[PDB]
Amino acid sequence: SLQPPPQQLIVQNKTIDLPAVYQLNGGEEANPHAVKVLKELLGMLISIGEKGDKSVRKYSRQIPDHKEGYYLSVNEKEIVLAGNDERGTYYALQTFAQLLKDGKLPEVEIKDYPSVRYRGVVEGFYGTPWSHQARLSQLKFYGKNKMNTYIYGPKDDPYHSAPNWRLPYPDKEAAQLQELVAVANENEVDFVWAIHPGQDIKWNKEDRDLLLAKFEKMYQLGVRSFAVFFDNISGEGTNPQKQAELLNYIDEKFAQVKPDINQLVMCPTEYNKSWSNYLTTLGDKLNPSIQIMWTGDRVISDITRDGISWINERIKRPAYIWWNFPVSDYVRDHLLLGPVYGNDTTIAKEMSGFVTNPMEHAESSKIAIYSVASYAWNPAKYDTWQTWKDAIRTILPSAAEELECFAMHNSDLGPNGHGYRREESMDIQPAAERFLKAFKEGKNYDKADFETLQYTFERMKESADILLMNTENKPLIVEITPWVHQFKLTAEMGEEVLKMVEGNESYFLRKYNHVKALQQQMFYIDQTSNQNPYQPGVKTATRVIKPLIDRTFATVVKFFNQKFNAHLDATT
């Protein structure tokens, strides 16, 4: 099982023992980073290098003729880790490290190349920006998962947006960005520095030269990939040709002069189909090498063939997709740990790049980031649920099943203004529906469904109490602790309701008081944890579990009220 799935893979159904002694060749001309990654994993011959080096002269024919492609041959004879370019060798080494298990290697032959040219993440979400260490871990994760594009565009940074983009970075923040670029180059990831100079910027001669000066400064810091954002810029510079001429100018002056500029991206004022003459002029009057960002048919929507062919006509170039998942700046009381799906699996040629907008929690976003890194590399072989489970195991192997059980019930976004929903709590939904139908009409409940609900609530309690004390991935646990508390409380309330449907009178009253106390606990967590201006509080399992619990509670409470002339408060 390899991730992301390679294009062509041949397995010989036989294993090869570890070479205790080896004679590696080509280390002086291959990628030094891949050389270090290889030596950290360490007679038998091992050849490694980019196409054209003497070490891989024998295997230049088998190299895929695509950027970031590689050829990896492990057999009884020797080992070949050849790459189409310097980044392809690093990706080959990542796949090779995936192949190694307990010092044994399968006899395989792999030819690989990315399906989408640019793949990665953009840190454009509203809310608390990531820490420096979190960004370093994210860069290393991207490098391990064959992602190449990280767009540094945090909304709460004054030096890349209005009005301080003209200012140089302070020496300390400049050193921080320098170490970011250093780690990115160490793991072969394009640090795309974003800038958004809008705010009603009527064009002139000063501001453009200040843009060029800031670009030269960031180049002095080591940045080699840049992007200009007009994302709903309220500027009167929503004029199409003004933006087109500005981007053409910065390409004509800064890109052609500088030797190793990699990416040049721009985001139009209209980045979705619902917010629309503008994109046509943009695509006609822009340089061919510059990319144009896009988010889909809506502000937060999936990518369909009719949703991409409709735009690729206007911009006259392959789109640079910007998916808004699992970003939760519009519903941050919920967790979005559901699987990545909905995008068509056969539109790789219709887009230049695919970048995801993640949550304010990085380790929690790693699930969808892993899924996108697999899908953006090979949409034809993108297994949705298997990749989701593989991401869960990769992030927390010690508690893979527990994190799986938790994420299964934290997927839906709940009601919101964008109308974006996610499927959640599916495997138990038929049991919940059958049980609520059996008790809503006063009939007899199915026993198998009762045992299933017991098992689910017990497993929720177990998974919550296991996740609370995990230390293998501490940042993740620190991110999801309040939601795990609410999850455990929901499991306990459901367990007590399941004991309430099997009644004497005093036992029922005790369980009723217990359920009320648990609702108070939930309100306390809602009013204390995750306090933000827009969507404060903590919510979990709101798709199936919470409605089922509330409805069963109300049903049994009304039955008791009409059976004993009581007037219990069934409000939740």
Which of 50/350 has CB closer to Ca ion?
Answer: 50
- Rounded least distance, CB 331 to Ca ion, Å: 47
Nearest approach, Cβ of residue 53 and Ca ion (Å): 5
φ, ψ of residue 540 to 5 degrees: the values are -155, 150
Query: In whole angstroms, how close is the CB of 63 to Ca ion at the nearest point?
Result: 13
Site for Ca ion, residues 480 to 539, rule: CB under 5 A: none
Site residue total, Ca ion (CB under 5 A) = 2
DSSP code at position 57? G
Among residues 64 and 153, whose Cβ is nearest to Ca ion?
64
Cα atoms found within 13 Å of the Cα of residue 122, Cβ hemisphere only: 32
**Residues 58 to 87: which contact Ca ion by CB under 5 A?**
none
Compare residues 53 and 190 and give the one whose CB is closer to Ca ion.
53
Token output for 214: 């800031």
Identity of the residue, 50 or 333, whose beta carbon is nearer to Ca ion in the bound complex:
50
Name the minimum Å distance from CB 255 to Ca ion: 24
Query: Could you please report the per-residue DSSP string of 179-233?
Result: HHHHHHHHTT-EEEEEE---SS----SHHHHHHHHHHHHHHHTT--EEEEE-TT-
**Interacting span for Ca ion (CB under 5 A) from 50-58, 164-172, 306-314, 540-548:** 50-58
Which CB sits closer to Ca ion, 50 or 449?
50
Q: Least distance in Å: CB of 26 to Ca ion?
A: 9
Query: Whole-number minimum distance, CB 57 to Ca ion, in Å?
Result: 13
Residue with tokens 């109300």: 554
Q: Cα 474 to chain center, whole Å?
A: 19
Q: How far apart are CA 549 and CA 495, in angstroms?
A: 9
C-beta of 29 vs 302, nearer to Ca ion: 29
Binding span for Ca ion by CB under 5 A among 28-36, 197-205, 402-410, 455-463: 28-36
First to last CA, the chain: 46
Q: Answer for the pair 219, 177: CB distance below 8 angstroms, yes or no.
A: no
**In the bound complex, which residue of the shown chain has the CB atom lying closest to Ca ion?**
50
| 50 vs 360, beta carbon nearer Ca ion | 50
188 binds Ca ion (CB under 5 A): no
Q: Cα(7)–Cα(114) distance, rounded to whole angstroms?
A: 8
- Residue 25 beta carbon to Ca ion: minimum distance, rounded to whole angstroms: 13
CB of 29 to Ca ion, least distance (A): 5
Cβ proximity of 83 and 62 under 8 Å: no
Among the listed ranges 15-23, 26-34, 361-369, 423-431, the one in contact with Ca ion (CB under 5 A) is 26-34
Nearest distance in Å: CB 66, Ca ion: 18
Nearer to Ca ion, 82 or 139 (CB): 82
Q: What is the rounded CA–CA span in Å between residue 96 and residue 74?
A: 9
Cis peptide preceding 326, ω within 30 of 0: yes
- Nearer Cβ to Ca ion (29/526): 29
User: H/E element holding 357?
Assistant: none
Note if the bond before 4 is cis, omega within 30 degrees.
yes
Closest separation in Å from C-beta 187 to Ca ion: 18
Candidate segments 45-53, 98-106, 364-372, 442-450, binder of Ca ion by CB under 5 A: 45-53
26 versus 494: smaller Cβ distance to Ca ion:
26
Residue 473's identity, in one-letter code, is N
| Minimum separation from the CB atom of position 60 to Ca ion (A) | 13
* CA 172/CA 497 separation, integer angstroms: 56
Which one of 16-24, 46-54, 252-260, 279-287 is the stretch in contact with Ca ion (CB under 5 A)?
46-54
DSSP assignment of 142-179, as one string? HHHTT--EEEE--TT-TTTSTTGGGSPPPHHHHHHHHH
Binding part of the chain for Ca ion, among 42-50, 168-176, 341-349, 473-481 by CB under 5 A, reads 42-50
CB of 49 to Ca ion, least distance (A): 6
What is the rounded CA–CA span in Å between residue 414 and residue 412? 6
Residue closer to Ca ion, measured from CB, 90 or 553 = 90
Positive or negative CA dihedral for 362, 366, 371, 377? positive
Rounded distance between C-alpha atoms, residue 191 and residue 245, angstroms = 24
Report CA Rg, the chain: 27
- Binding to Ca ion in span 461-480, by CB under 5 A: none
| CB nearer Ca ion, residue 188 or residue 496 | 188
Which DSSP state fits 6? P
Structure tokens at 564: 């004993």
Q: Which stretch binds Ca ion (CB under 5 A): 24-32, 462-470, 472-480, 494-502?
A: 24-32
Site for Ca ion in 291-350 (CB under 5 A): none
In whole angstroms, give the CA distance from residue 550 to residue 531: 25
Q: Which residues contact 522 (CB under 8 A, 6 or more apart)?
A: 486, 489, 490, 493
Site stretch for Ca ion (CB under 5 A), options 25-33, 240-248, 355-363, 388-396: 25-33
Of 183, 199, 121, 112, the closest CA to residue 153 belongs to 121
Q: What pairing do the DSSP bridges indicate for beta strands 8-17 and 104-112?
A: antiparallel
Nearest distance from C-beta of residue 140 to Ca ion, angstroms: 23
Q: Which of 5, 37, 50, 376 binds Ca ion (CB under 5 A)?
A: 50
Nearer CB in complex with Ca ion: 29/186: 29
Which residues are at the interface with Ca ion (CB under 5 A)?
Answer: 29, 50
